[PDB]
Structure 1
Amino acid sequence: PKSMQCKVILLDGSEYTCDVEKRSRGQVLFDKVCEHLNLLEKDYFGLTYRDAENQKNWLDPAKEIKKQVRSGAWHFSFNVKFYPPDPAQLSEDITRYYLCLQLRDDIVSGRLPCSFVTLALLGSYTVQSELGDYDPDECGSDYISEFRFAPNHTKELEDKVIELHKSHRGMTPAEAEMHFLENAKKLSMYGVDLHHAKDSEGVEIMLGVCASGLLIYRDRLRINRFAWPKVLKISYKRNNFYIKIRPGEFEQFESTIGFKLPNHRAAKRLWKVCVEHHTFFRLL
């Protein structure tokens, strides 16, 4: 039995290495990673890989790994796939912990925009979780944390993290992580997967996929939202992505909204993430 070496970037930035039989399905590798992580609430998570274009793809657990990575290295990342709308309802602290690590990367990367005060508050809960109670001995008037809190760090942000950290004395790691999530979950881009597209007039938009539905970001004044209930059918053909928007009461016919994606693979990817979100958040 011939086995292939897999390398997985974990959410703390460390590398897990294992071997799977070369015809293994994605679920086999995912089960090994989740066992390594002591993670039971596995349904929220998945593995990604980067293609020759360094674009992110979800590894389909039901399909052979080799038929997805194809020509590429067996190199993956462990990521949150379905962001829980209410992390307080997860059954395990360790689930909330991995969700926090993913969100920290969402923030530092700039995928999850955040006000100054929310960056500082989130940063303060991470410090409380990671180091425990504020200690003046490690922090002078010139302190800069090892923790990455933001896409662009300022001394002002470092000071505000410390000021809020002082207020959390006695807070346990699970408590600070729950506070982190209660704040992060409210952010307008929480759990939103963004895809570049053109509308039917060739005007550049973003499509966001999240628990509550599909978001069309036209301009700052024009943001259309289609709750999953309002979406009857999702389709792709060539470079095009289509959604069927339900008849509103007393209307005879569904409406169709068409989008142009960069290429066929980008249309397919968007279609599959929409179907998966529609299924997952229908089970809520």
Structure 2
Amino acid sequence: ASMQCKVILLDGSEYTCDVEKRSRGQVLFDKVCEHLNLLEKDYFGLTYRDAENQKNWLDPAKEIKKQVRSGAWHFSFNVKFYPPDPAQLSEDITRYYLCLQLRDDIVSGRLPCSFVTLALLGSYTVQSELGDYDPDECGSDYISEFRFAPNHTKELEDKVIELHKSHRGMTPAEAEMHFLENAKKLSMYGVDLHHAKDSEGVEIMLGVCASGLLIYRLRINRFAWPKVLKISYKRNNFYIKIRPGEFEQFESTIGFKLPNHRAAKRLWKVCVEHHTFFRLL
């Protein structure tokens, strides 16, 4: 009358529990956050891969059964809504799980940034995890475990060490806070990127975040939520209604062709959820 679930956590470890066969996603999410002693859980969710190996958020309001057709109820715990100002989070631990996610986002190449920013962010990670630089605990080899960037230059490594040396006295809470302030200013911070085609058939990327919808073709356009009147899908296609022009005198619907109905439905859902979260709480 129950099914085993496995969840990859942000530090790489694996949470196992059992849930009732007809459990809604909420059941499992609540168990994972309890495990994590996470009170600010609303920023977070669970992803799964479907039979086409596409990533999907587990809808907490719905039976897991209906979403994951396989009995392989394997999930990944992830940031869903990236806070525009992490300093305003109530708890250090929320910020910590947030850093872990952003570290992956960087290493995986999902959040690009300057060599400069990579080294600064790296040095904050090192101060958080290792503490103060010391020539006697720190060979010149003491940061061999850390990944900082999709690609490790021995010069990135030296710059991380240089900056680490300057952070002396800094507590994890502060290393992390500094980490979050440089990270939140990055261009792709918190943007969920989706492949699409525009009306001419030119391949573009439609990003969703706290502030609105982004189009990239090379970043191009950006629609703050306040200016999105309606978000909808039909078939392969994704639509937004906006009031263009200086005085917003008319409505215009802009359309994007997505690779299939399901890609359109995932984009639409993610956009709706972001609008609800960021604009209605």
Measured against the shorter chain, the TM-score band is over 0.9
Task: Evaluate the alpha carbon distance shift between residue 142 and residue 96 of structure 1 in structure 2; reply closer, same or farther with a 3 A threshold.
Answer: closer
Shift of 1:135: 2.0
Structure 2, gaps ≥5 residues long: none
Q: SS of the counterpart of 1:110?
A: coil
Question: In structure 1, the residue corresponding to 2:137 is in which secondary structure?
Answer: coil
CA separation in 1, counterparts of 2:245 and 2:156? 47
**Which residue in 1 is equivalent to 2:17?**
18
The residue aligned with 2:246 is 249
Q: CA deviation at 1:221?
A: 6.0
Question: Measured at CA, do residues 92 and 144 of structure 1 come closer, stay the same or move farther in structure 2, by a change above 3 Å?
Answer: closer
Q: How far did residue 114 of structure 1 move?
A: 1.1
User: Alignment partner of 2:10: what SS?
Assistant: coil
The answer to whether the 8 Å contact 1:51/1:72 transfers is no
Return the alpha-carbon distance in structure 1 between the equivalents of residues 159 and 242 of structure 2: 45
Q: Is the Cα contact below 8 Å between 2:243 and 2:249 reproduced in 1?
A: no
- SS, match of residue 146 in structure 1: coil
CA distance in 1, matches of 2:142, 2:92: 30
Relative distance call for 1:224 and 1:130 in structure 2 (3 A) is: same
Whole-Å separation in 1 of the counterparts to 2:71 and 2:251: 42
Q: CA 1:221/1:43 → structure 2, altered by over 3 Å: closer, same or farther?
A: closer
Q: Is contact 2:119-2:160 (8 Å) kept?
A: yes
Do 1:48 and 1:76's aligned partners in 2 also have CA atoms closer than 8 Å? yes
Identical residues among aligned pairs (%): 100
Q: Give unpaired runs (5+ residues) of structure 1.
A: none
1:93-124 per-residue CA deviation (whole Å, 9 max, x = no partner) reads: 00000000000000000000011111111111
Residue 88 of structure 1 aligns with which residue? 87
Q: CA deviation at 1:56?
A: 1.0
Q: What is the CA distance between 1:127 and its match in structure 2?
A: 0.7
Deviations 1:43-88 (A, max 9, x none): 1000000112221100000000010011351000000000000000
Question: Per-residue deviation at 1:249?
Answer: 5.5
The structural deviation recorded for 1:148 is 1.1
Using structure 2 for the length normalisation, give the TM-score. 0.96
Offset, 1:138: 4.0
The secondary structure found in structure 2 opposite 1:6 is strand
Matched with 1:103 is: 102
Q: Which moved more, 1:110-119 or 1:245-254?
A: 245-254
- State the shift of 1:171 in Å: 0.6
Which digits, 9 at most, give the CA deviation of each residue in 1:242-266, with x for residues without a partner? Answer: 1011254545421111000011100
Q: 1:141 offset after TM fit, Å? A: 4.2
Aligned residues of 1:230 and 1:246 also touching (Cα < 8 A): yes
Distance 1:140 1:243, change over 3 A: same
- 1:201-260 superposed Cα distances (whole Å, 9 cap, x missing partner): 11000000000000011xx66611100000011011110001011254545421111000
Check the 8 A contact 1:245/1:255 in 2, yes or no.
yes
Aligned partner of residue 255 in structure 2, secondary structure:
strand
Q: Compute the displacement of 1:154 (Å).
A: 1.2
What's the counterpart of residue 218 of structure 2? 221
| Aligned CA distance change for structure 1 residues 252 and 194 (closer, same or farther; 3 Å) | same
CA-CA distance at 1:144 after TM superposition: 4.6
Instruction: Report what 2:182 is aligned to.
Output: 183
Q: What SS does the aligned partner of 1:195 have?
A: strand
Contact (CA 8 Å) 1:199, 1:259: kept in 2 or not? yes
Distance 1:270 1:187 in 2: 22
Q: Deviations over 1:187-210 (max 9, x none)?
A: 000000000000011100000000
Change in Cα spacing, 1:233 to 1:144, as seen in structure 2 (3 Å) is same
**In 1, are the aligned partners of 2:107 and 2:148 still within 8 Å (CA)?**
yes
Q: CA deviation at 1:23?
A: 0.2
Aligned-residue Cα RMSD (Å) equals 1.4
Question: CA separation in 2, counterparts of 1:248 and 1:13?
Answer: 48
Give the secondary structure class of the aligned counterpart of 2:222: strand
Using the TM superposition, give the Cα deviation of residue 145 of structure 1 relative to its aligned residue in structure 2, in angstroms: 2.4
Following the alignment from structure 1 to structure 2, what is the Cα–Cα distance between the partners of residues 222 and 181? 23
SS across alignment from 1:43: helix
Distance in 2, Cα, partners of 1:149 & 1:117: 12
Label 1:41 to 1:222 Cα distance change in 2 as closer, same or farther (>3 A): closer
Identify if the C-alpha distance between structure 1 residues 98 and 143 changes in structure 2 by more than 3 Å, giving closer, same or farther.
closer
- Measure, in 2, the Cα distance between the counterparts of 1:214 and 1:20: 36
